[PDB]
């Protein structure tokens, strides 16, 4: 405890550069997991369409996908509009 705190204090005095790099470098590894927006970040990347949403043939029994790009059914992203 006392040795550890003194070693930090001796570091912070002898060198302020690597401790600052080690500190902010250390954080850059941990909070990405704890962040509650990282699952949102992948959703944003998934939302952005670079290729065409190629249509698929109808054979019945397909309620999920819409028949028109205005129908209420289908994947909607009003979460991202407010976000």
């Amino acid at each position: 405890a006392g040795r550890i705190a003194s070693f930090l204090k001796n570091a912070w005095a002898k060198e302020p550069v690597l401790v600052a790099s080690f500190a902010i470098g250390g954080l850059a590894i941990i909070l990405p997991s704890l962040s509650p927006y990282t699952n949102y970040a992948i959703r944003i990347n998934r939302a952005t369409p670079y290729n065409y949403p190629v249509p698929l043939r109808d054979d019945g029994n397909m309620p999920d996908v819409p028949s028109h790009p205005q129908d209420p059914q289908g994947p909607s992203l009003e979460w991202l509009k407010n976000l």
Binding site: K9, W12, A13, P16, V17
Partner: protein
């Protein structure tokens, strides 16, 4: 008599250490120099233009 010139041991208090750490990280004495020259930029130049005016004897 004589006066010692430079052996001033810096304090190791957390305030002093952070002050030195801020000084090293956020360059301050370098900025102190820049502010110095800028102040010494808006002065009046000591030059005199030649023969139209001449130095004092």
């Amino acid at each position: 008599t004589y006066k010692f010139v430079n052996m001033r041991e810096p304090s190791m208090d957390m305030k002093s250490v952070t002050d030195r750490a801020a000084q090293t990280l956020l360059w301050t004495e370098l900025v102190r120099g820049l502010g110095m020259t800028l102040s010494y930029l808006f002065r009046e130049p000591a030059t005199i233009n030649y023969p139209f005016e001449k130095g004092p004897l």
